[PDB]
Amino acid sequence: SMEQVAMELRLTELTRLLRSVLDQLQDKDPARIFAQPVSLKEVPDYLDHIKHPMDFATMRKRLEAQGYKNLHEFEEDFDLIIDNCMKYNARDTVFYRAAVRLRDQGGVVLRQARREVDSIG
Numbered sequence: 001s002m003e004q005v006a007m008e009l010r011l012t013e014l015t016r017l018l019r020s021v022l023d024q025l026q027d028k029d030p031a032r033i034f035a036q037p038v039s040l041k042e043v044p045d046y047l048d049h050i051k052h053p054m055d056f057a058t059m060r061k062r063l064e065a066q067g068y069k070n071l072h073e074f075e076e077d078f079d080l081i082i083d084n085c086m087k088y089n090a091r092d093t094v095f096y097r098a099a100v101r102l103r104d105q106g107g108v109v110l111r112q113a114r115r116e117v118d119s120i121g
Contacts, residue, residue: 014117015066018074021113022063025078026056028105033098034081038088049088054080071117075110 029035037055038046046053059077068074085099 010121011066011069013120014068014070015063017113017116017120018063018068018071021074021109022056022059024109025102025106028102028109029056029098031094031098033095034085034102046088050084052080053084056081071113078106078110 026035034056036057037053038050040046054077059074059081062068062077063074068077082099082103085095089095089099
């Protein structure tokens with residue numbers, strides 16, 4: 001149908017906007033602490049601690065499959081990255097501190113993304 005196509009064009013455009021959001025958020029992680037999944041070879045007990053692991057490469061796979069239907073879903077995954085880190089790692093670690101900085105800096109980017117998604121529909 002013509003409606004299914006119109007809906008698919010909306011999803012594609014959302015995907016385009018979320019790709020730019022993802023790039024901006026990942027720039028706020030210059031140390032690449034959150035770039036890839038925590039290694040189960042190197043942290044073999046990780047899944048005993050963290051039930052829903054997340055990282056930027058995993059988000060990028062979902063994004064490119066047009067697997068985010070709305071900004072809320074994308075934010076859920078970003079928040080997992082931060083929240084998993086802040087639970088697994090102690091306050092006095094480079095990892096925890098990197099998550100706090102990513103949260104604080106990403107807030108700005110996500111504030112305007114929400115306005116852009118509401119604005120452009």
